[PDB]
Amino acid sequence: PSVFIFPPKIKDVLMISLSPMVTCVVVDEDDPDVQISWFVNNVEVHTAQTQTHREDYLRVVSALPIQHQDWMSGKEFKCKVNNPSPIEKTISKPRGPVRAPQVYVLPPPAEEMTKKEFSLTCMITGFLPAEIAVDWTSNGRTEQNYKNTATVLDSDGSYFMYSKLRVQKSTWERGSLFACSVVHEGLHNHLTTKTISRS
């Protein structure tokens, strides 16, 4: 077989209310006896959840809940898998500079406020490292009809991205406050928002 190790979501590690996880997905019915051991800076940990997946097209999935600060301070996380000789797989957050994002919600054209539904754009600029989470709300309630671009390497070595939220011309005209909510390690309490409305 061959294994792939994935990082926690950056929003989960920066938000103490959330549950970050390191995930080990191992590729390759014959035998379903495969043990997955886990290590943080080479000390074995026994708290992972593993559930099995027989694929018809196997892959087993083991998720290690992690301490937020272990990821942030750069520890690695390793998964050793068993079922030849066993496969190792490591992962960590590398060290480097931090620059806070600048966040801007852009007013939409008028010709768009005409349509039954139109897009609000949030522009996020000047940040390092590139990992970032961007989502939206409406009157403080979680909103989901948005899409983010991938981050792009800008000329000064920082990153930028945009987020686009779809809105109902009816919800806008009733005075709903829309906000772009951005989570990044360079921000106060790891979060910042920008608001726009009809108003």
Add this chain to the structure above:
Amino acid sequence: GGPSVFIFPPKIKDVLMISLSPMVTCVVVDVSEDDPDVQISWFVNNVEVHTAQTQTHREDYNSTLRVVSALPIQHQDWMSGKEFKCKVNNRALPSPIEKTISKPRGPVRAPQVYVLPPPAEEMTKKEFSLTCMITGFLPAEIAVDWTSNGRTEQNYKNTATVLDSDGSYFMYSKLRVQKSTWERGSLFACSVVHEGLHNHLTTKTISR
């Protein structure tokens, strides 16, 4: 461990703008110094064509040769879904390697394009960002660039395209503008080339 072959499409800009020269390219990598003679043959809907420019390059990173064959093509032979095949011959190969490419069959839909002024809150800076917002297009291939007074600008960055919830694609391009340029009233244009657009082109301008 012997030669391998990659085929590449024309730039979308070069097939959509009749004045430019699109090409289909076949690249052979890991050609040995001991067997440098590579014959590439080219077929358009399985009829052989003989006009490809084929040259060899020495690749110093790892002591290999690279053979690049660029077939110039008709803009409409790409747009109408003709198949372009390269066939590569070399004495290190048991039998020829063949690669085929074509413009895939699928939907067409023009992008909505808006250029947006800088954020109110960026106007305390030495430089500002203009945003070209490009929405609702199929297929995903697109070219986007900028100009100031017809000079091409180079200080812009495009995001990759993103699959939207309706199945179309969107993208943004951000241009950096010096405060003084913006203030003296220079005209900034976002130009977008897509097969959906009447005359394959739209250009949106902004200033003030």
